[PDB]
């Protein structure tokens, strides 16, 4: 009765209330990419270090 009246009135006269996807974007964190793939620097590259190390520590093992 009143159930029917409400059911009808409610459903018909506005089903959903307005919404916009564009507005949502502002209020949510946007995807942003990691910066740089990165490559590790060549650690202790070449015998520059070795020649230095042999001389630097010619320290024996006692």
């Amino acid at each position: 009765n009143v159930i029917q009246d409400l059911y009808l009135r409610e459903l018909k006269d506005t089903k959903l209330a307005p919404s916009t996807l564009q507005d949502a974007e502002g209020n949510v964190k946007p995807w942003n990419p990691p910066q740089k793939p990165n490559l590790p620097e060549l650690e202790l590259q070449g015998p520059e270090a070795l020649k230095a190390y042999t001389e630097q520590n010619v320290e024996t093992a006692h």
């Binding site: 650690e43 070795l50 520590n57 010619v58 024996t60 006692h62």
Partner: protein, 85 residues
């Protein structure tokens, strides 16, 4: 990170400790060591290497050579007594 290179370097442990000094001593001393020493004296030969051997060796120090040595001087002057008398 990458280990240092000291553990695989040795070259002054051979002066680094005291038995190195002893080592270089006893490689010479013992390597050219004889099993036994040479002699406890043995020369005086003329039928007197026996006199030394019996009396003046490490075998004994006893009063027998003393008596003998005394008697030589006694024999000199005792004969000479009758040369003086």
């Amino acid at each position: 990170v990458s280990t240092l290179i000291p553990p695989k370097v040795v070259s002054s442990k051979n002066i680094g400790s005291a038995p190195n000094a002893k080592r270089i001593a006893n490689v010479v001393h013992f390597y050219k060591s004889l099993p036994q020493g040479p002699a406890p004296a043995i020369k005086a030969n003329t039928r007197l290497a026996r006199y030394k051997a019996k009396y003046f060796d490490g075998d004994n120090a006893s009063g027998k050579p003393l008596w003998h040595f005394a008697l030589g001087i006694i024999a000199f002057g005792y004969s000479m007594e009758y040369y003086f008398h």
